[PDB]
Symmetry: D2
Subunit: 267 residues, 4 copies
């Protein structure tokens, strides 16, 4: 297995369509021993993760809760055993209030809403690294999930801004992680039909935002030289596992694009 013997923490599972669910599945298929973290609905998350190939301890983590973060390392060590450390950390956490996405005009999002989204989607990447680097082995790897924000797009709005901040945060986390012999990188995925994404395309945030997202998705498969299947998160999961392995040992502070090549093509 690509990850045989590695101990890896995976955040961000909420449904069976979560990108993190497929990261966890593939990592377990490749021999990794997982610790999972979940937010708010731990009963639901436990029922979801019961469908993974192997059992994994589930710990509560609200990345806005300073007490959850202060205790996280101790709770992880309790789960994997004293004297054992983590080899991998997966950040698959994102949120932006609906005022900062959708048909609500970009100018109408209040800063309280934007700040909450930047807290959860960008600052928390630094928060998790701060908490977990002291229990990470040399040669370890931290990976977060990104959506290419280098150009503006309709509807994504403030979530795009949060991803631009996350990319900048990743470059500073790499500086800190390097002192531990640990890499830090993001995977910029193409669009994936999660429950939330399908709801938006169905009009949950207004009709025009739904129409814009659908047009965005269609251009992606058209641009990608190898195509793009928004219903299949497995290529994204494999790319995360690649970064968690020892096979990209000189890459850090960086972004790997698991997007079909779409960002390399204009039309």
């Amino acid at each position: 297995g690509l990850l045989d013997g590695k101990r890896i923490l995976v955040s961000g599972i909420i449904t069976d369509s979560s990108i993190a669910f497929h990261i966890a599945r593939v990592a377990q298929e490749q021999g990794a021993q997982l610790v999972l973290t979940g937010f708010d609905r731990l009963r639901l998350i436990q029922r979801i993760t019961d469908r993974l190939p192997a059992k994994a301890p589930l710990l509560e983590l609200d990345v806005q809760n300073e007490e959850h973060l202060a205790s996280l390392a101790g709770r992880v060590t309790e789960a994997i055993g004293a004297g054992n450390k983590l080899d991998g950390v997966v950040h698959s956490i994102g949120f932006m209030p609906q005022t900062g996405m959708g048909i609500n005009p970009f100018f109408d999002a209040p800063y309280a809403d934007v700040s909450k989204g930047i807290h959860i989607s960008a600052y928390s990447y630094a928060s998790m690294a701060k908490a977990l680097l002291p229990i990470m082995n040399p040669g370890g790897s931290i990976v977060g999930m990104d959506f290419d924000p280098s150009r503006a797009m309709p509807a994504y709005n403030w979530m795009t801004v949060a991803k631009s901040a996350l990319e900048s945060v990743n470059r500073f986390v790499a500086r800190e992680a390097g002192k531990y012999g640990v890499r830090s990188n993001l995977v910029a995925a193409g669009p994936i039909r999660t429950l939330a994404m399908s709801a938006i395309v169905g009009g949950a945030l207004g009709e025009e935002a739904g129409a814009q997202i659908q047009l965005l998705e269609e251009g992606w498969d058209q641009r990608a030289p190898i195509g793009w299947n928004m219903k299949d998160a497995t290529p994204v999961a494999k790319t995360v596992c690649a970064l968690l392995s020892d096979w990209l040992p000189a890459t850090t502070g960086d972004i790997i694009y698991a997007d079909g090549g779409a960002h390399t093509q204009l039309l």
Copy 2:
């Protein structure tokens, strides 16, 4: 004059070494009629701006104050006269609490501090555009001040993250401003010895942060094919005036580098 007849709002003057002071001076030398905005110390700012070549009305603007923003357009129209609109807006506003810069470790900045810095340094670019676009003429231009955040650097820390967010915000403001026939762009300046910057180099945020900033400044002049004079903000001011003029009419959502060419060179 390059800006003859144009009515331009300039934020961000606090001392005579403020980049915005030199923007205002050059704009007035080029025939623009200015409205100035200042934060908190309006008595001091008035005394400072008395040294500009021409008198200009000064309005109070704390970009974190929703009431200041809601009234800003009316106060500007009162200053320039009913029936007159703005042709230009200059955002020269930035702040990050010292916990997010300097020798305080990157991981030790609390999110309340980071959020305040992102509010003032990035979100407020959208806030000012929201307030002023309804009183801007077609062909108008909004310009904000940037510091290239595409790579991490020592000490800048969370302020770098805020600039990454600002660049993303600028691309969305351009979408909105375009409906008004208005351009939105940033000027990414090289380092300029403002009062705050000189204090940091003198050790105000710790000795190692001061040493890192000084090394950063020295490499800049070395890399710049035409050199870089951190004691001279006039080239930055002229570049802002270029974007405020009619001579870059097909550039928007973009970044112009007034940095000596340093960002185009590795060594």
Copy 3:
């Protein structure tokens, strides 16, 4: 005038739809004294440039002719008078054999054809700088024409590769030009309906290449927050004049996008 008193060489006029024709027109409107260079059809070019607002000497320059380049500085000094130097140089030269563009497959262009296109479109930017920098004044400016090659696109094919090379060449020319106090920059224009471009859209290089170019053009105006008029080269000409002026004095080795903002937007 923006360029009053400046002596500026402009290459690349071949028809009245040439981007360089509009650069020359606007520069003369702004008070510049021009020297023109033309390739192969000097009788035709003279008849074309007779329609410019002011007379200008026309010199023959085939950038593949080492003898033309070796004599160019002397012929320019003879035209503007001994003791006078150039303040500006405009490179508006590009060519790629049809085997390297159009419906002919990317893999089918022979290297002899590609090499000729890279010679004319990229290496010659260095060739002209080598020839003219010794007769350029401090504070001078060299500008070349670019088409954003950061992503692949249909039909442009090897010409895209040549533009990627040109952008790299520009960064090295800036290093050399800086020793003379001269800036070097490119303007990346949106698509402009020159005679050659209209012929391609009409099917001169095959129907599918024509269809691809037309779709490329349409997406450009759609993406540009301020729109894009491919029939109007005047915004591109003004941006070149901006770089030729003294109003971007700290920008070199760089690229200014005169494209409506289209490259800052995904959809």
Copy 4:
């Protein structure tokens, strides 16, 4: 093994310090069956590759020889057996005449020399893809070697321009390769002390070019958050193997940086 059962062609071995030698070693350690290609000194190359963990057929390939390219697919199929196809292709080929590198001024390289370097270092990536894609399996992968050319640097000179062209070529090769279900990507390596590189640092291309290269190398390890060992090509080889594997299945037209993270950091 990461590459068990895969049939992979590796070009570019000339000494035991060649990056391609270490690519081949690691690929064989990971179970790949190799076909090697060599240029000009096949007796020497055979003696060198005798030290690889497994025997591999060696075929002559001068990428400037149209007859070598026209026959290459048939010679590969003869080596791996009829009915078998390649799963991987490694382009590790580069050359620029000394007039285009070193202390010889950038402006003094004749175009004949530059054109030869661009032929070997950039066009040949398309040439090899044209030759080998018809005998490549779906899910296959083409990888070429890159050195980040996004900023100019001393001494690299025209070789930097060639790498900028190669990056553009890679994006078009991905378009073609996608029709075969094949990915195309580059690995941008940090500096590696090959025989040629050590000779340049020793002054083979002039003293100042040697001094500039040494300073470039030292800044690299300083910038890299995980450090950079120019004497160890193994991290670069592993990254190439990662791209040759099935673990980056949604990445194409792209660049993976195996450089210690140095390109993500300013100082």
